[PDB]
Structure formats: structure tokens, C-alpha cells
Amino acid sequence: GCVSNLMVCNLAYSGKLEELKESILADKSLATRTDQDSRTALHWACSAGHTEIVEFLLQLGVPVNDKDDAGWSPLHIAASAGRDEIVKALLGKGAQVNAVNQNGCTPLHYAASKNRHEIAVMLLEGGANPDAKDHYEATAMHRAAAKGNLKMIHILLYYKASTNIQDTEGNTPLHLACDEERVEEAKLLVSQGASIYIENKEEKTPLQVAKGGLGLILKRMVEG
């Protein structure tokens, strides 16, 4: 498909490595020329998962942190699209782990919302802030708890993510775990220090949001 008004962007998106290599080597300025969405060949190669094209552009020494018109960096694009090897390559060239797009999302928010375990680890090994808050003051942990992703909760706890940050509705990840009936996630969160006392904007603790017996189980875990 024609994703760009820029030839080199279409070549990068469609995985046309040799043609892209010919064009840029012939005119190295094409490597950083931007299209209608303010994207270069790097953004499109990240989107379509063309690792070798990404590696080519990085070895050329293109910038790795330029944002398109929606605030997306290559690292956002690679993390969202589940491009494990490209995320590794971008972190190897000092990609901004804590960059935010126009929704205030970091690459880790996307790793969390799409259950991308290996990418979350690479981002966190790379200095990602586990407590980065989006425009709704929500964290990676809010997403993991809401979706019931135990493996992702273990990753975020290992890298020292807080369990008690309130989003704009006053909900901690434990409120969301209780509301979505994520029983084993709720119990893990409490066992690791998630507060049963914090009230959301409806003046409810996680115990009060919890349904059918979960509230008493969590209360007993903290109070005996």
C-alpha cells in the first residue's frame, strides 16, 4: 500500500531493503527526509517490523528520537507493534525510553497495554520510569492490573513500580483489579503493598469496589 508521499518511506514500509539502500546511499539526505505525517523511513520500518532496514538506518547514524505528527517516536512505534529486535536496536542507539506522545504515553505504557513482556523488560533494563503517568495519571501497572496480566505485574514489581498511584478517577491498580474481578492479581498486589485504604473519587476503597468476597479476603491479608 502507498502509506507515504515519500518514495523512501514506502520502500521502508514494504521491506524493499536493496531499493532503499540504493536510494539512500545515492542520496544520504533521503534517510531523514520527512513525509506527510512527519515520518522518516525509520518510523515506517519500525511500524512494519523490518529489522534489517532499521539496522541499516541506525548504522548510517540517523536520529532515533524524532517524533511524527502524533508525537510517536520510533521506540513508541516499535513497542506498540511488538518489534522485539527493533526495540533492542533502538535502545542500543540511546532511544529516549521516557519519551511521551500526544496521549502522554511512554513506550512502556504500550508494552503494558499489549502484554509485551520482553519489550517491557528491555525498556525497564533501559531506564524506563515504571511510574510514568499518562494524561489520565495512569501507569503501566493500572493496565496490567485491569487486564489481569500476572506476568506483567511480576515484571513491573521487579523493576520497582509503585502499586498505589491514583489515576484521575482516584483509582489505584488495585481498584481496577478488584473492579475487573482479577482475584489472583488483586491478592498479589496486596501481598506486595497495594493499599486497601485509598479512596477513589466515588469515595470507595478497593475493598468496596471488590465483588463477592474478594474485599474480605484482601482485608484479612492486611488486618488478620
Side-chain angles (χ1 to χ4, degrees):
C2 268
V3 305
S4 188
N5 65 10
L6 244 190
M7 181 173 159
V8 287
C9 288
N10 294 318
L11 297 195
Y13 189 68
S14 60
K16 284 178 199 321
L17 168 56
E18 290 319 317
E19 292 171 53
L20 179 142
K21 279 197 56 173
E22 179 136 87
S23 302
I24 285 163
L25 289 184
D27 185 2
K28 273 184 28 213
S29 74
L30 293 185
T32 62
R33 194 103 90 71
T34 57
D35 67 14
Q36 82 288 338
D37 300 337
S38 302
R39 280 187 172 193
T40 73
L42 181 64
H43 297 92
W44 289 113
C46 293
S47 173
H50 298 309
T51 303
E52 187 168 0
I53 295 182
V54 172
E55 285 178 334
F56 172 68
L57 296 163
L58 294 184
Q59 214 209 302
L60 249 204
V62 302
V64 298
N65 297 311
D66 292 350
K67 296 194 189 176
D68 74 7
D69 283 350
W72 286 66
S73 69
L75 191 56
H76 285 107
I77 296 165
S80 196
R83 309 314 187 191
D84 284 27
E85 279 328 85
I86 288 158
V87 167
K88 188 163 162 216
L90 286 168
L91 285 177
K93 295 297 302 217
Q96 289 180 30
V97 280
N98 294 318
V100 295
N101 63 9
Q102 292 188 159
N103 313 301
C105 280
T106 64
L108 179 66
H109 284 108
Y110 289 111
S113 73
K114 296 195 179 191
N115 220 204
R116 311 220 184 270
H117 300 100
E118 304 297 323
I119 286 166
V121 169
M122 281 183 280
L123 288 170
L124 289 154
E125 289 269 11
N129 177 6
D131 294 344
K133 296 158 81 182
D134 66 14
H135 286 349
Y136 297 95
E137 301 214 68
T139 67
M141 186 64 82
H142 281 90
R143 286 148 170 93
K147 294 158 51 67
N149 294 171
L150 273 175
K151 285 172 181 175
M152 188 63 75
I153 294 171
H154 274 86
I155 292 171
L156 287 166
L157 291 173
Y158 178 74
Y159 292 103
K160 317 274 211 194
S162 318
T163 57
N164 288 318
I165 293 172
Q166 288 176 284
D167 69 15
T168 51
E169 298 161 83
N171 286 313
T172 69
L174 180 62
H175 287 100
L176 301 195
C178 293
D179 191 45
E180 296 283 1
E181 306 196 42
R182 312 296 190 183
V183 168
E184 295 309 312
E185 295 82 352
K187 292 163 83 189
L188 180 63
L189 284 169
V190 169
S191 70
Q192 294 304 131
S195 164
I196 64 168
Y197 305 109
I198 292 169
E199 287 186 357
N200 69 12
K201 290 226 180 317
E202 286 175 0
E203 295 184 310
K204 290 173 177 211
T205 70
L207 305 191
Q208 296 172 304
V209 156
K211 309 156 193 212
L214 183 49
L216 185 62
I217 288 163
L218 306 178
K219 177 183 192 182
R220 294 195 156 142
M221 289 176 72
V222 179
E223 291 185 3

